[PDB]
Design a protein around this motif. Sequence first.
Motif, PDB file in Angstrom:
ATOM      1  N   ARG B  16     -25.729  -9.492  -0.585  1.00  0.00           N
ATOM      2  CA  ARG B  16     -24.378  -9.412  -1.379  1.00  0.00           C
ATOM      3  C   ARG B  16     -24.714  -8.297  -2.307  1.00  0.00           C
ATOM      4  O   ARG B  16     -25.595  -8.448  -3.080  1.00  0.00           O
ATOM      5  CB  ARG B  16     -23.704 -10.615  -1.903  1.00  0.00           C
ATOM      6  N   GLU B  27     -17.515  -6.648  -4.136  1.00  0.00           N
ATOM      7  CA  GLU B  27     -18.486  -7.268  -3.242  1.00  0.00           C
ATOM      8  C   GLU B  27     -18.279  -6.683  -2.020  1.00  0.00           C
ATOM      9  O   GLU B  27     -17.333  -6.777  -1.251  1.00  0.00           O
ATOM     10  CB  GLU B  27     -18.443  -8.556  -3.350  1.00  0.00           C
ATOM     11  N   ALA B  39     -14.806 -11.778  -0.864  1.00  0.00           N
ATOM     12  CA  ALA B  39     -13.681 -12.037  -1.570  1.00  0.00           C
ATOM     13  C   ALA B  39     -13.852 -12.023  -2.976  1.00  0.00           C
ATOM     14  O   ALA B  39     -13.052 -12.130  -3.808  1.00  0.00           O
ATOM     15  CB  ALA B  39     -13.746 -13.720  -1.320  1.00  0.00           C
ATOM     16  N   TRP B  80     -14.634 -18.608  -5.403  1.00  0.00           N
ATOM     17  CA  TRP B  80     -15.208 -18.268  -6.777  1.00  0.00           C
ATOM     18  C   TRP B  80     -14.604 -18.798  -7.892  1.00  0.00           C
ATOM     19  O   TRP B  80     -13.436 -18.776  -8.187  1.00  0.00           O
ATOM     20  CB  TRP B  80     -15.291 -16.747  -7.064  1.00  0.00           C
TER      21      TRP B  80
HETATM   22  C1  LIG Z   1     -17.915 -16.234   3.356  1.00  0.00           C
HETATM   23  O1  LIG Z   1     -17.371 -15.627   2.418  1.00  0.00           O
HETATM   24  C2  LIG Z   1     -18.416 -14.635   1.774  1.00  0.00           C
HETATM   25  O2  LIG Z   1     -19.496 -14.952   1.749  1.00  0.00           O
HETATM   26  C3  LIG Z   1     -19.691 -15.701   0.372  1.00  0.00           C
HETATM   27  C4  LIG Z   1     -20.993 -16.118   0.386  1.00  0.00           C
HETATM   28  C5  LIG Z   1     -19.295 -14.993  -0.790  1.00  0.00           C
HETATM   29  O3  LIG Z   1     -20.126 -13.739  -0.861  1.00  0.00           O
HETATM   30  C6  LIG Z   1     -17.738 -14.522  -0.666  1.00  0.00           C
HETATM   31  O4  LIG Z   1     -17.270 -13.762  -1.782  1.00  0.00           O
HETATM   32  C7  LIG Z   1     -17.730 -13.624   0.694  1.00  0.00           C
HETATM   33  O5  LIG Z   1     -16.338 -13.307   1.144  1.00  0.00           O
END
Ligand SMILES: CO[C@@H]1O[C@@H](C)[C@@H](O)[C@@H](O)[C@@H]1O
Lengths: 90, 88, 88
Positions: B16, B27, B39, B80
Amino acid sequence: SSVQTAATSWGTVPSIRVYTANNGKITERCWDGKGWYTGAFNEPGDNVSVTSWLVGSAIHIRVYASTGTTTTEWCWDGNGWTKGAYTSTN
Amino acid sequence: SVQTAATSWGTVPSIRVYTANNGKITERCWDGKGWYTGAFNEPGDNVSVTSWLVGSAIHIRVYASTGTTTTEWCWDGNGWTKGAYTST
Amino acid sequence: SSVQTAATSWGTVPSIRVYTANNGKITERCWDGKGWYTGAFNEPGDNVSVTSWLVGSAIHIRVYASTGTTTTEWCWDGNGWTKGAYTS
Ligand SMILES: CO[C@@H]1O[C@@H](C)[C@@H](O)[C@@H](O)[C@@H]1O
Ligand SMILES: CO[C@@H]1O[C@@H](C)[C@@H](O)[C@@H](O)[C@@H]1O
Ligand SMILES: CO[C@@H]1O[C@@H](C)[C@@H](O)[C@@H](O)[C@@H]1O
Ligand SMILES: CO[C@@H]1O[C@@H](C)[C@@H](O)[C@@H](O)[C@@H]1O
Ligand SMILES: CO[C@@H]1O[C@@H](C)[C@@H](O)[C@@H](O)[C@@H]1O
Ligand SMILES: CO[C@@H]1O[C@@H](C)[C@@H](O)[C@@H](O)[C@@H]1O
Protein backbone atom coordinates in the motif's frame (compact mmCIF):
# COMPACT_ATOMS: atom_id res chain seq x y z
CA SER A 1 3.55 24.32 8.01
CA SER A 2 2.79 20.66 8.89
CA VAL A 3 4.68 18.31 11.13
CA GLN A 4 6.34 15.22 9.65
CA THR A 5 6.07 11.72 11.09
CA ALA A 6 7.56 8.26 10.88
CA ALA A 7 6.06 5.07 12.33
CA THR A 8 7.15 1.54 13.16
CA SER A 9 5.48 -1.41 14.86
CA TRP A 10 6.26 -4.92 16.03
CA GLY A 11 4.59 -8.10 17.16
CA THR A 12 0.84 -8.73 17.19
CA VAL A 13 -0.34 -6.57 20.06
CA PRO A 14 1.21 -4.51 18.43
CA SER A 15 3.64 -2.08 19.87
CA ILE A 16 3.78 1.15 17.80
CA ARG A 17 6.22 4.06 17.91
CA VAL A 18 5.42 7.31 16.09
CA TYR A 19 8.15 9.93 15.73
CA THR A 20 7.22 13.55 14.95
CA ALA A 21 9.54 16.27 13.65
CA ASN A 22 8.11 19.64 14.78
CA ASN A 23 9.98 22.94 14.87
CA GLY A 24 13.36 21.25 14.77
CA LYS A 25 12.67 18.65 17.43
CA ILE A 26 11.74 15.00 17.14
CA THR A 27 9.58 13.46 19.86
CA GLU A 28 8.03 10.03 20.24
CA ARG A 29 4.59 8.64 21.13
CA CYS A 30 4.16 5.03 22.04
CA TRP A 31 1.48 2.35 22.12
CA ASP A 32 1.91 -1.01 23.86
CA GLY A 33 -1.76 -2.01 23.96
CA LYS A 34 -3.50 0.15 26.53
CA GLY A 35 -3.03 3.86 25.71
CA TRP A 36 -0.62 6.24 24.07
CA TYR A 37 2.23 7.67 26.13
CA THR A 38 5.26 9.85 25.50
CA GLY A 39 8.45 7.99 24.89
CA ALA A 40 12.03 8.70 25.89
CA PHE A 41 13.26 9.66 22.41
CA ASN A 42 13.85 13.39 22.11
CA GLU A 43 16.52 14.65 19.71
CA PRO A 44 16.93 17.48 17.21
CA GLY A 45 15.74 17.09 13.69
CA ASP A 46 13.67 18.58 10.92
CA ASN A 47 13.05 15.21 9.27
CA VAL A 48 12.72 11.69 10.65
CA SER A 49 12.60 8.15 9.32
CA VAL A 50 12.60 4.88 11.24
CA THR A 51 13.02 1.14 10.85
CA SER A 52 12.96 -1.67 13.38
CA TRP A 53 13.50 -5.40 13.67
CA LEU A 54 13.09 -8.12 16.27
CA VAL A 55 15.69 -10.51 17.58
CA GLY A 56 13.39 -12.96 19.32
CA SER A 57 11.11 -10.67 21.33
CA ALA A 58 13.73 -7.90 21.66
CA ILE A 59 13.02 -4.82 19.58
CA HIS A 60 15.79 -2.89 17.86
CA ILE A 61 14.90 0.54 16.48
CA ARG A 62 16.91 2.88 14.27
CA VAL A 63 15.76 6.49 13.94
CA TYR A 64 17.34 8.71 11.27
CA ALA A 65 17.15 12.36 12.29
CA SER A 66 18.17 15.01 9.76
CA THR A 67 18.90 18.71 10.06
CA GLY A 68 20.24 20.39 6.93
CA THR A 69 22.32 17.77 5.19
CA THR A 70 23.36 15.98 8.42
CA THR A 71 21.60 12.71 9.31
CA THR A 72 22.20 11.22 12.74
CA GLU A 73 21.19 7.64 13.53
CA TRP A 74 19.82 6.84 16.96
CA CYS A 75 19.69 3.27 18.24
CA TRP A 76 17.40 1.48 20.67
CA ASP A 77 18.55 -2.07 21.45
CA GLY A 78 16.52 -2.61 24.63
CA ASN A 79 18.55 -0.45 26.96
CA GLY A 80 18.33 3.25 26.07
CA TRP A 81 19.00 5.45 23.03
CA THR A 82 22.55 5.85 21.75
CA LYS A 83 24.03 7.41 18.61
CA GLY A 84 24.75 4.94 15.81
CA ALA A 85 27.52 4.54 13.27
CA TYR A 86 25.56 5.88 10.27
CA THR A 87 27.22 8.54 8.19
CA SER A 88 26.55 9.99 4.78
CA THR A 89 28.35 12.61 2.70
CA ASN A 90 25.31 14.65 1.65
CA SER B 1 6.40 17.34 -4.64
CA VAL B 2 3.88 14.94 -3.32
CA GLN B 3 4.82 13.02 -0.18
CA THR B 4 4.49 9.24 0.08
CA ALA B 5 4.57 6.44 2.61
CA ALA B 6 4.64 2.72 1.86
CA THR B 7 4.00 -0.57 3.66
CA SER B 8 3.88 -4.20 2.57
CA TRP B 9 3.06 -7.60 3.99
CA GLY B 10 3.59 -11.26 3.25
CA THR B 11 5.51 -12.70 0.34
CA VAL B 12 3.24 -11.96 -2.62
CA PRO B 13 3.56 -9.18 -1.45
CA SER B 14 0.67 -6.85 -0.84
CA ILE B 15 1.80 -3.19 -0.97
CA ARG B 16 0.00 0.00 0.00
CA VAL B 17 1.36 3.40 -1.03
CA TYR B 18 -0.17 6.54 0.50
CA THR B 19 0.30 9.91 -1.26
CA ALA B 20 -0.27 13.35 0.23
CA ASN B 21 -1.06 15.80 -2.59
CA ASN B 22 -2.40 19.30 -1.96
CA GLY B 23 -3.82 18.42 1.40
CA LYS B 24 -5.42 15.09 0.43
CA ILE B 25 -4.03 11.62 1.14
CA THR B 26 -5.03 8.79 -1.19
CA GLU B 27 -4.00 5.16 -1.51
CA ARG B 28 -2.78 2.82 -4.24
CA CYS B 29 -2.81 -0.89 -3.68
CA TRP B 30 -1.04 -3.97 -5.03
CA ASP B 31 -2.20 -7.50 -4.14
CA GLY B 32 -0.19 -9.33 -6.79
CA LYS B 33 -2.34 -8.59 -9.88
CA GLY B 34 -2.09 -4.88 -10.70
CA TRP B 35 -2.38 -1.56 -8.91
CA TYR B 36 -5.74 -0.10 -7.97
CA THR B 37 -7.04 2.86 -5.97
CA GLY B 38 -7.95 1.91 -2.44
CA ALA B 39 -10.60 3.09 -0.03
CA PHE B 40 -8.34 5.28 2.07
CA ASN B 41 -9.15 9.02 1.67
CA GLU B 42 -8.28 11.49 4.44
CA PRO B 43 -6.95 15.03 4.70
CA GLY B 44 -3.32 15.67 5.37
CA ASP B 45 -0.12 17.21 4.17
CA ASN B 46 2.41 14.52 5.43
CA VAL B 47 1.74 10.77 5.87
CA SER B 48 3.43 7.79 7.51
CA VAL B 49 2.24 4.20 7.80
CA THR B 50 2.91 0.92 9.57
CA SER B 51 1.21 -2.45 9.36
CA TRP B 52 1.31 -5.89 10.95
CA LEU B 53 -0.21 -9.30 10.43
CA VAL B 54 -2.21 -11.21 13.05
CA GLY B 55 -2.15 -14.63 11.38
CA SER B 56 -3.55 -13.91 7.94
CA ALA B 57 -5.29 -10.64 8.88
CA ILE B 58 -3.65 -7.33 8.01
CA HIS B 59 -3.86 -4.32 10.26
CA ILE B 60 -2.72 -0.90 9.01
CA ARG B 61 -2.20 2.43 10.79
CA VAL B 62 -1.84 5.60 8.74
CA TYR B 63 -0.71 8.82 10.45
CA ALA B 64 -2.00 11.90 8.64
CA SER B 65 -0.70 15.33 9.69
CA THR B 66 -2.12 18.81 9.16
CA GLY B 67 -0.42 21.63 10.99
CA THR B 68 0.58 20.16 14.34
CA THR B 69 -2.29 17.63 14.50
CA THR B 70 -1.70 14.07 13.52
CA THR B 71 -4.72 11.80 13.11
CA GLU B 72 -4.35 8.03 13.09
CA TRP B 73 -6.51 5.98 10.75
CA CYS B 74 -7.01 2.28 11.35
CA TRP B 75 -7.65 -0.63 8.98
CA ASP B 76 -8.72 -3.76 10.81
CA GLY B 77 -10.54 -5.56 8.01
CA ASN B 78 -13.54 -3.45 7.17
CA GLY B 79 -13.04 0.25 6.59
CA TRP B 80 -10.92 2.96 8.05
CA THR B 81 -11.67 4.23 11.55
CA LYS B 82 -10.14 7.08 13.60
CA GLY B 83 -7.61 5.71 16.05
CA ALA B 84 -6.77 6.64 19.64
CA TYR B 85 -3.49 8.37 18.74
CA THR B 86 -2.89 11.80 20.15
CA SER B 87 0.23 13.89 20.52
CA THR B 88 1.18 17.26 21.93
CA SER C 1 15.70 23.16 4.76
CA SER C 2 16.64 19.58 5.33
CA VAL C 3 17.23 16.38 3.43
CA GLN C 4 14.47 13.79 3.62
CA THR C 5 15.11 10.14 4.38
CA ALA C 6 13.47 6.73 4.26
CA ALA C 7 14.72 3.52 5.81
CA THR C 8 14.12 -0.23 5.62
CA SER C 9 15.75 -3.27 7.23
CA TRP C 10 15.60 -7.04 7.06
CA GLY C 11 16.74 -10.20 8.77
CA THR C 12 18.59 -10.47 12.06
CA VAL C 13 22.04 -9.05 11.17
CA PRO C 14 20.23 -6.86 10.13
CA SER C 15 20.75 -5.28 6.75
CA ILE C 16 19.61 -1.63 6.60
CA ARG C 17 19.12 0.69 3.63
CA VAL C 18 18.69 4.43 4.09
CA TYR C 19 17.61 6.59 1.17
CA THR C 20 18.21 10.34 1.20
CA ALA C 21 16.55 12.95 -1.06
CA ASN C 22 18.74 16.06 -1.38
CA ASN C 23 18.08 18.74 -3.97
CA GLY C 24 16.36 16.36 -6.26
CA LYS C 25 18.79 13.48 -6.03
CA ILE C 26 18.11 10.29 -4.05
CA THR C 27 21.08 8.20 -2.93
CA GLU C 28 21.45 5.14 -0.71
CA ARG C 29 23.60 4.12 2.24
CA CYS C 30 23.82 0.48 3.22
CA TRP C 31 24.64 -1.58 6.30
CA ASP C 32 25.24 -5.35 6.09
CA GLY C 33 26.87 -5.77 9.50
CA LYS C 34 30.39 -4.40 9.14
CA GLY C 35 30.25 -0.76 8.09
CA TRP C 36 28.17 1.66 6.05
CA TYR C 37 28.78 1.89 2.32
CA THR C 38 27.20 3.74 -0.58
CA GLY C 39 24.76 1.62 -2.52
CA ALA C 40 23.87 1.36 -6.18
CA PHE C 41 20.59 3.29 -5.96
CA ASN C 42 20.71 6.69 -7.64
CA GLU C 43 17.51 8.22 -8.98
CA PRO C 44 15.88 11.62 -9.12
CA GLY C 45 13.32 12.82 -6.64
CA ASP C 46 12.39 15.31 -3.96
CA ASN C 47 10.61 12.75 -1.75
CA VAL C 48 11.32 9.11 -1.02
CA SER C 49 9.58 6.23 0.74
CA VAL C 50 10.52 2.56 0.86
CA THR C 51 9.23 -0.86 1.80
CA SER C 52 10.83 -4.32 1.54
CA TRP C 53 10.02 -7.99 2.09
CA LEU C 54 11.90 -11.28 2.19
CA VAL C 55 11.06 -14.25 -0.02
CA GLY C 56 13.08 -16.92 1.74
CA SER C 57 16.49 -15.33 2.03
CA ALA C 58 16.03 -12.99 -0.93
CA ILE C 59 15.29 -9.35 -0.27
CA HIS C 60 12.92 -7.38 -2.46
CA ILE C 61 12.86 -3.58 -2.11
CA ARG C 62 10.47 -0.97 -3.53
CA VAL C 63 11.50 2.68 -3.44
CA TYR C 64 8.93 5.37 -4.33
CA ALA C 65 10.56 8.52 -5.66
CA SER C 66 8.44 11.61 -6.31
CA THR C 67 9.02 14.76 -8.37
CA GLY C 68 6.01 17.04 -8.68
CA THR C 69 2.95 14.76 -8.78
CA THR C 70 4.82 11.92 -10.47
CA THR C 71 5.91 8.97 -8.34
CA THR C 72 8.28 6.43 -9.85
CA GLU C 73 8.69 2.99 -8.28
CA TRP C 74 12.12 1.42 -8.30
CA CYS C 75 12.51 -2.31 -7.72
CA TRP C 76 15.35 -4.36 -6.28
CA ASP C 77 14.83 -8.08 -6.84
CA GLY C 78 18.39 -9.33 -6.58
CA ASN C 79 20.27 -7.81 -9.48
CA GLY C 80 20.02 -4.07 -9.96
CA TRP C 81 17.28 -1.52 -9.77
CA THR C 82 14.53 -1.69 -12.37
CA LYS C 83 11.56 0.59 -12.85
CA GLY C 84 8.25 -0.76 -11.56
CA ALA C 85 4.63 -0.79 -12.76
CA TYR C 86 3.37 1.53 -10.05
CA THR C 87 1.20 4.16 -11.42
CA SER C 88 -0.86 6.82 -9.74
C1 LIG D 1 -9.59 -4.48 0.50
O1 LIG D 1 -9.41 -3.04 0.63
C2 LIG D 1 -8.14 -2.59 0.22
O2 LIG D 1 -7.10 -3.16 1.03
C3 LIG D 1 -7.19 -2.78 2.45
C4 LIG D 1 -6.16 -3.59 3.19
C5 LIG D 1 -7.04 -1.30 2.55
O3 LIG D 1 -5.75 -0.94 2.04
C6 LIG D 1 -8.18 -0.62 1.73
O4 LIG D 1 -8.13 0.79 1.86
C7 LIG D 1 -8.12 -1.10 0.32
O5 LIG D 1 -9.26 -0.51 -0.38
C1 LIG E 1 10.56 1.43 27.04
O1 LIG E 1 10.84 2.59 26.38
C2 LIG E 1 9.90 2.87 25.36
O2 LIG E 1 9.93 1.94 24.31
C3 LIG E 1 11.23 1.85 23.66
C4 LIG E 1 11.16 0.72 22.67
C5 LIG E 1 11.55 3.18 23.03
O3 LIG E 1 10.56 3.45 22.06
C6 LIG E 1 11.56 4.27 24.13
O4 LIG E 1 11.92 5.56 23.65
C7 LIG E 1 10.22 4.27 24.83
O5 LIG E 1 10.25 5.27 25.90
C1 LIG F 1 25.90 -2.29 15.96
O1 LIG F 1 25.83 -1.09 15.15
C2 LIG F 1 24.63 -0.41 15.31
O2 LIG F 1 23.53 -1.17 14.80
C3 LIG F 1 23.63 -1.44 13.37
C4 LIG F 1 22.48 -2.33 13.02
C5 LIG F 1 23.66 -0.14 12.59
O3 LIG F 1 22.39 0.54 12.86
C6 LIG F 1 24.84 0.74 13.08
O4 LIG F 1 24.94 1.95 12.40
C7 LIG F 1 24.71 0.93 14.57
O5 LIG F 1 25.86 1.67 15.05
C1 LIG G 1 -7.23 -0.86 19.37
O1 LIG G 1 -6.75 0.48 19.23
C2 LIG G 1 -6.39 0.80 17.90
O2 LIG G 1 -5.31 0.02 17.45
C3 LIG G 1 -4.09 0.20 18.22
C4 LIG G 1 -3.07 -0.78 17.69
C5 LIG G 1 -3.67 1.66 18.11
O3 LIG G 1 -3.38 1.92 16.73
C6 LIG G 1 -4.78 2.55 18.65
O4 LIG G 1 -4.43 3.94 18.60
C7 LIG G 1 -6.03 2.27 17.85
O5 LIG G 1 -7.12 3.09 18.38
C1 LIG H 1 24.21 -5.61 -2.98
O1 LIG H 1 23.78 -4.28 -3.40
C2 LIG H 1 23.44 -3.45 -2.31
O2 LIG H 1 22.29 -4.03 -1.61
C3 LIG H 1 21.09 -4.12 -2.43
C4 LIG H 1 20.09 -4.89 -1.63
C5 LIG H 1 20.66 -2.74 -2.85
O3 LIG H 1 20.39 -1.99 -1.66
C6 LIG H 1 21.80 -2.11 -3.67
O4 LIG H 1 21.45 -0.80 -4.16
C7 LIG H 1 23.07 -2.08 -2.84
O5 LIG H 1 24.13 -1.55 -3.69
C1 LIG I 1 6.29 -7.80 -10.39
O1 LIG I 1 5.90 -6.35 -10.44
C2 LIG I 1 6.78 -5.56 -9.74
O2 LIG I 1 6.78 -5.95 -8.32
C3 LIG I 1 5.50 -5.79 -7.69
C4 LIG I 1 5.60 -6.28 -6.30
C5 LIG I 1 5.11 -4.29 -7.80
O3 LIG I 1 6.08 -3.54 -7.04
C6 LIG I 1 5.09 -3.88 -9.24
O4 LIG I 1 4.68 -2.51 -9.41
C7 LIG I 1 6.45 -4.13 -9.88
O5 LIG I 1 6.44 -3.78 -11.28
